[PDB]
């Protein structure tokens, strides 16, 4: 009997999105990609084509104004002025004319993909990039905003901007004092880093990490939000990407931001920290040494359910590490809150607390006092309760935790000459023996075989007490 492999059943660390396909309704926690910068058309078009500089400017100012704060983008385009606006950005034009033309084009690029395409096909991008070299602070602010909308439209325009060598001049903007310029440039930079398939050219966007290290030392909330999001995108990668973030010494301040007052900051900061602990034990210890464990304790109590979930996921990739790292989690008093979420939290969060406790128990086979403490904190009952409701993957993870707990109890019985396996008695006392036993009814063979082994090894009418 043949069936498709994914319809058959016959390293604990987990990366961000190993499986991208989703059935659930997509919920956006991310910053909107595009931003807008807040009929006598015939007459304006005549002034814009005029040879007089002051006539050109008054026309450009009007086109920018109607495009500010809804805006008739498609109408301006229909007037055929987009290439003229692009000409006004050329290196040999007046500063104020460049400013207005770039502002108007920014808002045309702020609309639909078709409207952004108009500006891109008009060869505006190389000029924006040039204005980043040559413009005043006011000119540089309009050009970088324009590049943000192009980049935020799609991965293709994101890559086109990078192929035009925009990164070098963009990274020069962050010497400015003007908080509005830093804000806008940080958002544009996050748009150049955003997007999973395809990811941007690593050789180019990793050049931004020194700048991002500086930006997360801003105390401007808006700047921190988009800087942390940028780091969260760049840190979503293999060990090499994580190591580039570690090398610029981002983790210390990144961990500090987990305690920022604003959940708009905590969310991307926690996402980035979560990404970093998906590498190896050495990279993970760098985050531990930065104080992530105390910070995670508070986030387990966050009012945002998604913060609690991501905190549990982050902890689970830490307890996927070595004995000392598991002990560090215990030492930071993270188990009591994890056990609490394991029994009261929403399923998606509860599911993540299960991974964390389960992974800890896998390493607890080498340091039995680890499992003693876990049992001491009352994890057995929540784990067993989870067997009745969980998806099949979480059933398997929960049975592996209970098996580790049973192995430890059995090894402890033999080592100390105890009469009975204490953890097996706890599991039966909590009603967990029946819930494990009932997993044998699952048509999933991996689940059935695991439950059968547990039942027959630890609850199978072993012996008369002698």
């Amino acid at each position: 009997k043949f069936v498709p492999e994914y319809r058959r059943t016959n390293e604990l660390r987990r990366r961000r999105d190993t499986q991208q396909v989703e059935l659930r309704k997509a919920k956006r926690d991310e910053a909107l990609a595009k931003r807008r910068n807040f009929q006598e058309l015939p007459q304006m078009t005549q002034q814009l084509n005029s040879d007089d500089m002051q006539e050109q400017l008054s026309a450009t100012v009007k086109f920018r104004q109607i495009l500010s704060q809804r805006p008739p983008i498609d109408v301006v385009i229909q007037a055929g002025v987009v290439p003229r606006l692009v000409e006004f950005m050329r290196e040999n034009q007046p500063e104020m004319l460049q400013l207005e033309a770039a502002w108007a084009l920014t808002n045309i690029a702020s609309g639909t993909s078709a409207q952004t395409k108009v500006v891109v096909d008009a060869d505006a991008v190389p000029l924006f990039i040039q204005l980043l070299y040559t413009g005043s602070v006011e000119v540089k602010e309009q050009a970088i905003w324009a590049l943000g909308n192009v980049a935020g439209d799609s991965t293709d325009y994101r890559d086109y901007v990078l192929q035009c060598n925009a990164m070098e001049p963009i990274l020069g903007l962050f010497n400015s004092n003007k908080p509005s310029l830093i804000r806008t440039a940080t958002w544009t930079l996050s748009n150049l880093c955003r997007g999973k398939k395809p990811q941007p050219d690593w050789s180019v966007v990793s050049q931004a990490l020194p700048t991002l290290a500086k930006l997360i030392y801003s105390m401007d909330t808006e700047t921190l939000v988009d800087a942390c999001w940028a780091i969260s995108y760049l840190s979503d990668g293999p060990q090499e990407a994580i190591q580039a973030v570690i090398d610029v010494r981002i983790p210390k301040r990144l961990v500090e931001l987990l305690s920022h007052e604003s959940t708009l900051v905590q969310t991307p900061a926690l996402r980035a920290v979560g990404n970093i602990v998906t590498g190896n034990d050495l990279q993970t210890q760098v985050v531990i040494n930065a104080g992530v464990l105390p910070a995670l304790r508070l986030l387990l109590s966050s009012p945002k359910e998604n913060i609690k979930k991501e905190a549990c996921w982050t902890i689970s990739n830490i307890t996927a590490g070595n004995t000392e790292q598991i002990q560090a989690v215990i030492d930071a008093n993270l188990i009591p809150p994890l056990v609490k979420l394991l029994e009261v939290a929403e399923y998606k969060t509860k599911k993540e607390a299960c991974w964390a406790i389960s992974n800890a128990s896998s390493g607890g086979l080498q340091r039995p006092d680890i499992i003693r403490y876990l049992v001491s904190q009352g994890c057995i009952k929540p784990l067993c309760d989870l067997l009745e409701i969980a998806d099949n993957r979480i059933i398997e993870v929960t049975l592996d935790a209970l098996e580790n707990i049973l192995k430890m109890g059995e090894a402890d019985k033999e080592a100390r000459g105890l009469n009975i396996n204490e953890n097996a008695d706890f599991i039966e006392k909590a009603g967990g023996m029946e819930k494990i036993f009932n997993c044998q009814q699952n048509e999933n063979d991996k689940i059935y075989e695991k439950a059968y082994k547990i039942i027959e090894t630890y609850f199978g009418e072993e012996e008369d007490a002698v």
Binding site: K1, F2, V3, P4, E5, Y6, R7, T9, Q19, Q20, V21, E22, L23, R24, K25, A26, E305, E343, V344, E346, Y347, K348, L365, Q366, P368, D385, E388, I389, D391, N392, R393, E396, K407, M408, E410, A411, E414, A415, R416, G417, L418, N419, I420, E422, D425, E428, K429, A430, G431, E434, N442, E443, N444, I447, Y452, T457, E463, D464, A465, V466
Partner: protein, 950 residues
Amino acid sequence: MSDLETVAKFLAESVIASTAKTSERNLRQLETQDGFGLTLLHVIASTNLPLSTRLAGALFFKNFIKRKWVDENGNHLLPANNVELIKKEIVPLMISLPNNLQVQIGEAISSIADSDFPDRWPTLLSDLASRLSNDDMVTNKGVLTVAHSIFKRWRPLFRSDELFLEIKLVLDVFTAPFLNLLKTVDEQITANENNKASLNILFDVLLVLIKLYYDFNCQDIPEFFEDNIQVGMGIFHKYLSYSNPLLEDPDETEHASVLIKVKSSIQELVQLYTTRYEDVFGPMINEFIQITWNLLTSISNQPKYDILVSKSLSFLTAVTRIPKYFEIFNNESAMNNITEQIILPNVTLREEDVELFEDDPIEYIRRDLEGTDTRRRACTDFLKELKEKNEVLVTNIFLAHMKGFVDQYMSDPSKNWKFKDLYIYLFTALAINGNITNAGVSSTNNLLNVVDFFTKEIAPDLTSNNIPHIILRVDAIKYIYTFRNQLTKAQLIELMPILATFLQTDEYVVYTYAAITIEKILTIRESNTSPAFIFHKEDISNSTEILLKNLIALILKHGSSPEKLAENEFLMRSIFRVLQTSEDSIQPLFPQLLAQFIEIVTIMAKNPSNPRFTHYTFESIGAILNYTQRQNLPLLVDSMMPTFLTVFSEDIQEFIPYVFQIIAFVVEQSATIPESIKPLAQPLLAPNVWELKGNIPAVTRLLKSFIKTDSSIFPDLVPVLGIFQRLIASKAYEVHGFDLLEHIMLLIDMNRLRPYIKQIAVLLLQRLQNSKTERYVKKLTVFFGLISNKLGSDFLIHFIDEVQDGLFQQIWGNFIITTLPTIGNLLDRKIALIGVLNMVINGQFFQSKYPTLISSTMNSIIETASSIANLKNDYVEEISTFGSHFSKLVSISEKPFDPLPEIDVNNGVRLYVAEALNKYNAISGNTFLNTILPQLTQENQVKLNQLLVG
């Protein structure tokens, strides 16, 4: 003449007994003709044929698909032309058939889909969905049943991208028609409120729609069902309360109807949504709680609602575990209304149980002792869940009701005795934290006093001359059983003469529960860190004889037929426990007790019936022998062996593995082989004794005991080696082969083994080339270590090289040092590790002859000594055949042979290795470690320094 006519002829013959087998053989021959698949479809469609013939054709086609549609790799086995035409005809054919045929064609479609959907059958989904219509609920049921058969395959799967892509494909086709059809079935059900036939049809469709709703949501809640949740769940919300006299009939109390199943399927889906998708479902949970509360309020106690009640309580249990929703009934008013309306009416003792008490006492006891889905159990588990969330509130609310139950009983105990059974049951449920285990109750509710309740409510019912109902006498005994850990030794001692007096009554459940409670009292340990029991021998010695006398009389009370004598295994379990506790208290009576057990064995041999009774009979015999003075064993042996010989000669296989264990123990404990046992030694070696899996562990033990106690009883070692060969050649029995071999090599003088030592090595190593298993190579490695530790390093080298010069170093470098670090069993790891180390530090010949082996051997030693509990810890489904089961007697169990007892397997091994290496280095003038350190891997040079500097 026609091939269609010929197929129909034998399809018809297949329903008749005389031609059932010949017809299949003819059909299998006809099956080779090309197009037979399509010929079957034409037969199925032929309305001129009798329905049974068309049904035989539909069943044959279905099973033809299962046999010959694809091979193990998914290659179609039929001509590519037939394959595509089948897929085109099958769905339209299904629609046109009446139900009995339609369902089998639906199942053939599902079988094709199992291998071909979705990649190799892109049209199926559209094909199926396009057959749904608002005006034909018969065809709808058929189509939806096929869809459910295909989509329910998602339920046991792990999430994956490939699966979610498949699910997405299905949702794009079905979501709109599914919801529309669901939105059409509710409308027609209301319009057809008084049409019985059309109602049953509509609710059949509703049931499958509900199951499909579950299929679509078992992996995640898809976007479509999140958006349309209010209309979807709103409909199910409605039908949880729906009631129509046409779809009900009070005259049926067991057979749940389609309406009942629909509400149960709804509750399954509601619990899925409540426990997985509370974020989305949250706003609607309160509505379902209230309707579930009303549903349980007005539900008849008839069994046909049992499942619906339990599924409703599991929903309410999931709600109790969500703090936000538990608070709506976390107050005295709601909690008290749950008690009166939901819990108490279903916890009372129902008389369907009282009848089991009177008619099948032994079964009543077994089920009472081990326990599901009865209303009592479902409601009691719910009661527990509430108590866990607010113990003070729940306890006090029930203490108030129980207070009134006491007065209801005391007013008229004779008629209201059931009220006392109630609050004893409720008190027990509230007092126990969690569940009782085989070890008893470990902790209780601090708001209740089990000792006070015992003195006031239980103890008087033990000794009262008259009892309103013997069920209360059982309840009192069971209370002692339940709370035995909470009573003092002095309180238990005071109960022992009372429980023992029950063994002289005639009430089946009273004297059995008394025997059970005595046995469990004798199993209470003082603590889990030492083996001592609360009850020592001086606590039972004065009553041992009268307990045994009365337990034996109860066994014999209803006649000495094999089936009735062995009926009550709890009596013999208690005899065993009493014997174990009393030890040598009544040694002078051992000959008479043993004679009584032997007579029981003799009677049961005519028809062994109760395996637990049989087991504890032989445990009891084992206990007697264990506490008999060794010089008195021969007299006991002589009184048993005539019966044991008859067990062999009559081939009572149920007893044979027990008799072998008993005889082995006797031999193990004697300084010489008793004369009555000597004649068994050489017949033991006959190959036919070693054929049944259930006997191998026992005859291996007996053979080992002969070798250890007096190996001269075997004048020829050839047949002993023949057993070893049989065991070691077998993957199933290899462990016993190694066990036997250890006895042979270590306990038989080398002068006797000399003519056979080469052959032994050849046999032992033949497995390596032919049919090696991982367990075999691990056991071989442990065996090498054992030989090294005992007979020495030089012996081991010349034992293997005797097979072929050079074989030692080849096996050492390929199997031993590679396998050593993988041995997970702690005692075996110590033996292997210490034995391998012994070769390096106590093998001057090993060092001088194989100098280049030392570095790789040291790498293996260091890795093994410096490493985990993650390794497989033991050496552990299939068809049971007669005699395939072996049961170990704990009364005469033996612990494994540890040749290195001064080294604890826990931490002593690592310390021992480090001290042995340091010593060897010191004896070498401090040149060994310096010379070998550069030859080790980088990793092991570090681990080694941690060992020495540890």
